[PDB]
């Protein structure tokens, strides 16, 4: 919910700095990722509604133990708000931030053999919307720069024309590029249109609307942070400033 509300690249990258990797892990068993299932949608039909489960969902799913699964669970967290179940990860990795996992060599994860086409198929890319695809390309770019496989990032972009057009433009090592970005990456937010409490058919759509309606309640809750009315009550670290910079970069 908090990750899906990040609109700018600066806000999203700042959130990935604070958030430890444990929030990407789910600790819940879930079910098998790819499976044809019959679900109940009684607001529209009496007959059970066919659907196919996918990794990009608001629910836990079983994920492979290797480094491939860990990367996929991070991306699924960013684009869907919920991760996967990867059992028995060391405490050292779980306390590290998500950005450190994607952009640092200190962690023991080896990602040099990652294939971007295989990952994009597993985390179904034909099903994502434009904002979800932009968030995925941010994660791919961070992995490429840490690994030195910046050419593999470009070949992947050239094989898919629509992804190249919407690919976010920033340098993972320069903060000036992040500030200049005008991309909008907010999956959930305050809706200009009228949003009702009705259910939706697909698992992805119904799960997304749950996050959308939850954010509106979170918007009007006391936990939400109103800058225009309580800016002096905020700690100096968390206050909005023009000179705010990520570690390194």
């Amino acid at each position: 919910m908090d990750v899906l509300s990040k609109g700018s690249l600066k806000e999203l990258l700042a959130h990935l700095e604070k958030t430890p990797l444990e929030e990407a892990i789910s600790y819940r068993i879930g079910t098998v990722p790819y499976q044809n299932v019959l679900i109940s949608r009684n607001e529209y039909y009496n007959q059970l509604y066919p659907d196919t489960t996918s990794l990009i969902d608001g629910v836990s799913r079983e994920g492979q133990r290797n480094v491939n699964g860990l990367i996929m669970s991070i991306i699924s967290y960013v684009v869907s708000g919920s991760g996967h179940y990867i059992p028995n990860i060391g405490f050292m990795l779980l306390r590290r931030s998500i950005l450190d996992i994607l952009t640092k060599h200190d962690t023991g994860l080896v990602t040099n053999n990652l294939n971007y086409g295989i990952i994009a198929r597993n985390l179904t890319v034909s099903k994502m919307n434009c904002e979800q695809r932009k968030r995925m390309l941010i994660c791919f770019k961070l992995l490429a720069y840490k690994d030195g496989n910046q050419n593999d990032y470009e070949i992947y972009l050239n094989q898919n024309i629509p992804l190249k057009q919407i690919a976010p433009n920033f340098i993972p090592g320069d903060m000036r590029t992040v500030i200049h970005n005008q991309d909008q990456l907010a999956i959930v937010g305050i809706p200009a249109y009228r949003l009702t409490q009705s259910t939706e058919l697909s698992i992805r759509d119904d799960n997304a609307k749950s996050y959308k309606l939850g954010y509106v309640d979170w918007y009007n809750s006391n936990s939400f942070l109103r800058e225009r009315s309580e800016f002096n009550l905020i700690r100096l670290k968390d206050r909005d400033t023009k000179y705010g910079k990520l570690n390194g970069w």
Partner: protein, 298 residues
Amino acid sequence: ANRATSAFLDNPHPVGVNYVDEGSRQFVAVAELLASKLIDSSRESDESNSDVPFVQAYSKFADDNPRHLRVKTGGKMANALTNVIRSYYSINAPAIVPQVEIDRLASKATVSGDMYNSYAIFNSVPIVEVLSPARTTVSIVGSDRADVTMLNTGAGAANITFNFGQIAETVILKGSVPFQLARLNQPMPAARFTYKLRPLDGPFIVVLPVGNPLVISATAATRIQVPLAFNKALVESGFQTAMNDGLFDIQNVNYYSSFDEFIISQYHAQDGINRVSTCVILGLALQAYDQMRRALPV
């Protein structure tokens, strides 16, 4: 055993899984409403001698004032409507339009995107399989009116099995000469010209006498939930325009003669229920595409 099927029912391609949320549905309904006013503005332009009614409606639709210099295209709404149609047809088509743009366009009008408040009648005839013995020849032709021609060349009469699926509500059979059709394990009735069948009851056996060919004409009616603003005449016109404009030109898809054939073919897939919802939204968008492109041709 020879198995004959309808041509349009084979290999339904996957449909898009995008722009089916509440915000996107409101965008398509807004586009239909604003495109309707755009057409009506032409008539209101004729009652007077000014173009103010058309300029007023174009600005609402396109967020920009019309100019005599350039060809009136439709602005940001035209690009969004065109790209959203492509994403509906195939899952391989990209979802180019951002959700922020759709939310902005949905706030122009105060319509509610409820796509299950009415119904429509679809006349495509689903013939899943016609099973015939060795000596007989069976040919199925057409979608709106299925003309099944069967000829028996063997010594004795033949029994032909008809399977009309499990989706169509009613099917009416009319033959060139009187014939006998009964459900499986039921006694054959006398020869009649017209039979009325409910497809859910079971497969039907038709007795083919030896001699002159027998031709059966079938008409089907299917009820599918649609928005109240649905106009079948406008939807069909938009489908032909989108096909001609190349909106459906994408690899690994199937092409259909009419929106009647498209929606019935998707409904008769393995999991066709989830496809029908997306197809209906495509029809409403196609209805808006027809109205808008007629007012503003490029």
